[PDB]
Amino acid sequence: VDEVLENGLEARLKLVPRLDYGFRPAQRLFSEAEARVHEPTIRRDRDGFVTYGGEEYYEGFLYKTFRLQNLIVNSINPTLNELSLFQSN
Amino acid sequence: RNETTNTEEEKERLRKEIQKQLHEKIQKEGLARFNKSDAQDGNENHAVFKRYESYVRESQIPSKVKNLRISIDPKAQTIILPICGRPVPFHINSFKNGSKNEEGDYMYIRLNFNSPGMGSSVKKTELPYEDGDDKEFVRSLTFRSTNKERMSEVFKAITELKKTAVKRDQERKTMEDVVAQAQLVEFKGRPKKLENVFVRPAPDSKRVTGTLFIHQNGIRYQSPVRSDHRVDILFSNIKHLFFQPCKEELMVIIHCHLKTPLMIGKKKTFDVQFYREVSDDEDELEQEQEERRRKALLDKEFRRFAEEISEASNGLLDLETPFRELGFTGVPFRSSVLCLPTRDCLIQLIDTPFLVVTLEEIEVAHLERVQFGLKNFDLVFVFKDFSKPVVHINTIPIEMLEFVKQWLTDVDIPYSEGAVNLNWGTIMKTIQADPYEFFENGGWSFLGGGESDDEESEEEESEFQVSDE
Amino acid sequence: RERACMLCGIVLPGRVFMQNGCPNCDSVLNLRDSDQATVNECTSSSFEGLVAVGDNEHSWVAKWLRVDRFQPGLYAVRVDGRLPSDIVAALEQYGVYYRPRDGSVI
Amino acid sequence: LLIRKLPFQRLVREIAQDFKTDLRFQSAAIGALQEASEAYLVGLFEDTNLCAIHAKRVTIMPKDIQLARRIRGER
Amino acid sequence: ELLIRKLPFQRLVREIAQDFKTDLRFQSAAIGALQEASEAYLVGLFEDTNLCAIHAKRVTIMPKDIQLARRIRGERA
Amino acid sequence: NIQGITKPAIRRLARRGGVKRISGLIYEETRGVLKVFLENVIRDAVTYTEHAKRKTVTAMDVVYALKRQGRTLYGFGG
DNA sequence: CCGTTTTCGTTGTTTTTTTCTGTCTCGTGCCTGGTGTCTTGGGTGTAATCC
DNA sequence: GGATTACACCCAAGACACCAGGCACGAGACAGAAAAAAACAACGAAAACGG
Numbered sequence: 001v002d003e004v005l006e007n008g009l010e011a012r013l014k015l016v017p018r019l020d021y022g023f024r025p026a027q028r029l030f031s032e033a034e035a036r037v038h039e040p041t042i043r044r045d046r047d048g049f050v051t052y053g054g055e056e057y058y059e060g061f062l063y064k065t066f067r068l069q070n071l072i073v074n075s076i077n078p079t080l081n082e083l084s085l086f087q088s089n
Numbered sequence: 090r091n092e093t094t095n096t097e098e099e100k101e102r103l104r105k106e107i108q109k110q111l112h113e114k115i116q117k118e119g120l121a122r123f124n125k126s127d128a129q130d131g132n133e134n135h136a137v138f139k140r141y142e143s144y145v146r147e148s149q150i151p152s153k154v155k156n157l158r159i160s161i162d163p164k165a166q167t168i169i170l171p172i173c174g175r176p177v178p179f180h181i182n183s184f185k186n187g188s189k190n191e192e193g194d195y196m197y198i199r200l201n202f203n204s205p206g207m208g209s210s211v212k213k214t215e216l217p218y219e220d221g222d223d224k225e226f227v228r229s230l231t232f233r234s235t236n237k238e239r240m241s242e243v244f245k246a247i248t249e250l251k252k253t254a255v256k257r258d259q260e261r262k263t264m265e266d267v268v269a270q271a272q273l274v275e276f277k278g279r280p281k282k283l284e285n286v287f288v289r290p291a292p293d294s295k296r297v298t299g300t301l302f303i304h305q306n307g308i309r310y311q312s313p314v315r316s317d318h319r320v321d322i323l324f325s326n327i328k329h330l331f332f333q334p335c336k337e338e339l340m341v342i343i344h345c346h347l348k349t350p351l352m353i354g355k356k357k358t359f360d361v362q363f364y365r366e367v368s369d370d371e372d373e374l375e376q377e378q379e380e381r382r383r384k385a386l387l388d389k390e391f392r393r394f395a396e397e398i399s400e401a402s403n404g405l406l407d408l409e410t411p412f413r414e415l416g417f418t419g420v421p422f423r424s425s426v427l428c429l430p431t432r433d434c435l436i437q438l439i440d441t442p443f444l445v446v447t448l449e450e451i452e453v454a455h456l457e458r459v460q461f462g463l464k465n466f467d468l469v470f471v472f473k474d475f476s477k478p479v480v481h482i483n484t485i486p487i488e489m490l491e492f493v494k495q496w497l498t499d500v501d502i503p504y505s506e507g508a509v510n511l512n513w514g515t516i517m518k519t520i521q522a523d524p525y526e527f528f529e530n531g532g533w534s535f536l537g538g539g540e541s542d543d544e545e546s547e548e549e550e551s552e553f554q555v556s557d558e
Numbered sequence: 559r560e561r562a563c564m565l566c567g568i569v570l571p572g573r574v575f576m577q578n579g580c581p582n583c584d585s586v587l588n589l590r591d592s593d594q595a596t597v598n599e600c601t602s603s604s605f606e607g608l609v610a611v612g613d614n615e616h617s618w619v620a621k622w623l624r625v626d627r628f629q630p631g632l633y634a635v636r637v638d639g640r641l642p643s644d645i646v647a648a649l650e651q652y653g654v655y656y657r658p659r660d661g662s663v664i
Numbered sequence: 665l666l667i668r669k670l671p672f673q674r675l676v677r678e679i680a681q682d683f684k685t686d687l688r689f690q691s692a693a694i695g696a697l698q699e700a701s702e703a704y705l706v707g708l709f710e711d712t713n714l715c716a717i718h719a720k721r722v723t724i725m726p727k728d729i730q731l732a733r734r735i736r737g738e739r
Numbered sequence: 740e741l742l743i744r745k746l747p748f749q750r751l752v753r754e755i756a757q758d759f760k761t762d763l764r765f766q767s768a769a770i771g772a773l774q775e776a777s778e779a780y781l782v783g784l785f786e787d788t789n790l791c792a793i794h795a796k797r798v799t800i801m802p803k804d805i806q807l808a809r810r811i812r813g814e815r816a
Numbered sequence: 817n818i819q820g821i822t823k824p825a826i827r828r829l830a831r832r833g834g835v836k837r838i839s840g841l842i843y844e845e846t847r848g849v850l851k852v853f854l855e856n857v858i859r860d861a862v863t864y865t866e867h868a869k870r871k872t873v874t875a876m877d878v879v880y881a882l883k884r885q886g887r888t889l890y891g892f893g894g
Numbered sequence: 895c896c897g898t899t900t901t902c903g904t905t906g907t908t909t910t911t912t913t914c915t916g917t918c919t920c921g922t923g924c925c926t927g928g929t930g931t932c933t934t935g936g937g938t939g940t941a942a943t944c945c
Numbered sequence: 946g947g948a949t950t951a952c953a954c955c956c957a958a959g960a961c962a963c964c965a966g967g968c969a970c971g972a973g974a975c976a977g978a979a980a981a982a983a984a985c986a987a988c989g990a991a992a993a994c995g996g
């Protein structure tokens with residue numbers, strides 16, 4: 001939970017992107033080189049903050065707002081693999 | 090201030106003295122360029138008729154003609170018309186326009202043909218018929234038929250044949266004055282290249298990014314989507330090479346102005362532009378700083394590439410950059426644009442159509458609309474080649490008048506001022522008819538008439554600087 | 559569309575809060591004289607427990623909700639979101655103590 | 665002055681004939697009226713030329729005059 | 740209702756005023772009057788700009804439209 | 817403090833003025849125009865204040881400064 | 895308000911020639927047609943709360 | 946059992962805009978008719994000055 005919206009109905013979250021760059025693809029850090037090779041229409045707004053296909057990826061991690069009705073805030077079961085993938089940066 | 094206005098006005102007397110020495114110089118260099126022997130050898134110019142033919146032999150006429158009806162031969166661009174049992178051919182070139190009217194059971198189609206007297210929009214240079222005061226012309230033929238559907242199809246096919254003929258003639262003209270250029274010699278090693286570049290005019294209706302390559306005797310633009318959309322430009326054919334960085338623009342530019350026009354796709358052009366675009370409270374201020382970084386990056390890369398083009402030319406091409414601080418706003422075409430001086434040219438490259446005026450090719454500048462408290466003025470450039478049409482720059486703000494006059498003086502261009510928009514279509518045709526007689530009677534030096542020649546004034550009151558009562 | 563003014567607890571449409579401001583909190587919030595960000599920071603559309611009060615003076619509920627000194631109308635038992643630190647300091651400048659109605663403070 | 669001095673005098677008298685019958689005029693009244701009228705019209709033609717150039721044109725048309733008088737605040 | 744936020748306009752006014760005399764005070768009614776006048780002026784200017792844009796046979800207002808309107812009004816020389 | 821006049825505010829002012837589509841440079845152009853207007857008006861107001869030998873700018877100074885420009889304002893004590 | 899001076903406004907006549915016009919052809923710019931691609935709607939479809 | 950509904954997304958249309966073609970109404974050109982303009986002289990209303 002990178003950001004909590006003051007409204008409390010939604011919140012901006014840090015996620016691992018699920019893209020194929022052109023039934024869901026496995027989660028993987030957004031790779032700018034592969035994204036440009038498969039889709040040269042990448043946008044840039046800041047250093048380390050990249051917007052590709054309308055989705056904002058910050059230093060390889062997706063940052064997208066999600067509804068409160070889209071989250072489980074209790075009985076959360078973590079895995080080392082995801083923990084390492086999140087804490088490596 | 091009085092001693093500075095005296096100093097500034099003495100520099101303005103030097104400005105006027107230079108302008109007078111420029112008018113006298115051009116008058117002497119017009120009398121030396123045109124001799125009385127050239128006036129005696131006056132060349133009369135005559136309308137050129139493009140000769141065409143429908144058929145040479147009666148065998149060439151198709152056997153389909155046997156029907157006593159209107160038969161069209163697209164291969165020979167011919168409309169065979171049944172005139173009293175005669176298979177009379179009429180070439181699509183002789184044909185002008187057609188009108189179809191279904192009156193009752195018969196379809197009355199009147200096919201009009203080219204006839205002198207405010208006829209076709211084609212210029213006098215090329216006439217669709219041979220010049221002849223004693224020549225009589227078939228102006229129109231009206232036919233009727235009981236079969237409405239076929240007669241409608243025949244009319245469509247005549248109209249299509251005319252459209253195809255006009256399109257082919259435009260395509261030819263867009264390739265005509267274009268001089269047959271030498272073939273670009275590819276560089277045998279790894280060529281220097283600039284990627285993700287857009288070209289203007291575009292070779293296809295679709296805007297596609299390409300790569301620009303430097304070769305031994307020119308540059309090549311090459312689209313990644315189609316190999317056939319290559320644009321080759323020889324160094325020998327480039328007249329001027331401009332670079333323009335993003336000082337206020339959303340775009341970076343490398344512009345090639347050409348000596349001879351090239352046929353890019355369907356368009357004849359003297360100008361070929363290569364460009365790329367940057368476009369895609371502290372956070373918004375930082376986003377402007379990130380755009381300023383992206384500007385500086387593309388500026389550095391495209392400037393370097395334009396210098397590398399200049400180096401590859403072996404000193405045939407100088408790299409020019411616009412002096413933005415000397416720029417003024419005006420309307421050369423249909424939009425208000427910033428006109429930018431360079432070393433050797435007056436340019437506008439941001440919007441199409443492009444303006445490129447070479448300063449050395451100017452004979453005289455005329456400032457139109459200049460008079461008592463006027464809001465704006467127009468600037469007219471006359472060229473040394475009187476066959477070249479004059480260039481108008483309209484609505485230059487009156488605040489820029491004294492700056493433009495100074496700039497024209499600093500470039501050794503004579504100028505004149507007038508309250509009225511003088512017609513140049515008239516002025517030029519008279520000057521083209523006899524250039525020698527023009528200079529004999531004072532050329533533009535007499536027209537200038539800088540001398541105020543005003544002594545009438547408005548009288549004066551009893552001159553008495555003494556206190557009264 | 560309705561929002562609950564965080565300070566007094568009244569509930570009114572957000573456009574009403576923007577156009578006219580809070581009839582009770584305008585002496586300390588200036589909600590009408592405040593931009594949309596301040597309106598959101600003092601009026602929240604996410605709330606719970608609609609309350610209608612008829613007589614502030616004698617209603618024990620109004621005293622329990624500390625709204626017995628305000629205009630009768632629509633009020634919310636719980637309001638999502640709290641006043642910002644700068645607005646809290648501004649109110650403390652005026653000498654008025656702010657008690658959150660978010661329920662997390664009791 | 666581009667307009668003449670006698671047609672303009674007659675126009676001024678004709679217009680003045682509505683507000684009070686048989687009114688005399690003075691040495692520098694008609695001259696001042698003509699100067700003001702020509703200055704006003706020249707300014708209006710300046711604004712009209714600006715609008716016509718704005719429309720990418722060179723010919724001034726009555727709608728440019730109307731736009732100029734609208735922006736000036738003229739009724 | 741006023742379409743500009745009050746604090747930004749107050750900060751802008753104080754920033755501008757600080758270039759003529761330091762330690763100046765403004766009654767709140769002075770800022771309110773300034774905001775009313777500025778918005779009324781800007782709305783009239785935008786109406787003239789819209790008229791110019793429609794005259795040019797367009798829908799999008801452009802900086803050249805603003806400059807032309809201000810020139811015709813007699814505000815820019 | 818001139819960045820406080822955000823793009824949405826200029827959009828709102830253009831919508832109340834009836835403008836249907838807006839270029840991207842309109843915002844900077846409008847900021848410049850507003851700055852010029854405010855500069856003139858505040859300069860006149862501060863002149864009035866200094867003459868009145870005050871350190872506070874009243875509503876009367878603003879009203880007289882607008883009357884000076886020809887922008888007469890009603891409802892502020894005029 | 896009343897008497898004075900004398901400028902320049904009103905009155906009329908003759909002559910000049912620049913401006914208005916009848917007439918023609920050409921062209922350039924007004925208007926119709928073909929096309930771009932963006933902002934947005936209406937809909938399917940997957941998925942769901944509620945009682 | 947039943948139903949209306951949230952929500953993401955696809956297939957598609959309305960709109961302001963860009964580019965091209967062509968036909969006619971305007972500018973340019975020339976020879977002719979018109980009356981605005983220029984120049985002249987006469988008369989005196991009324992403007993500028995005074996007590």
Ligand SMILES: [Zn+2]
Pocket residue numbers: 563564565566567568580581582583584
């Ligand atoms: Zn409240």
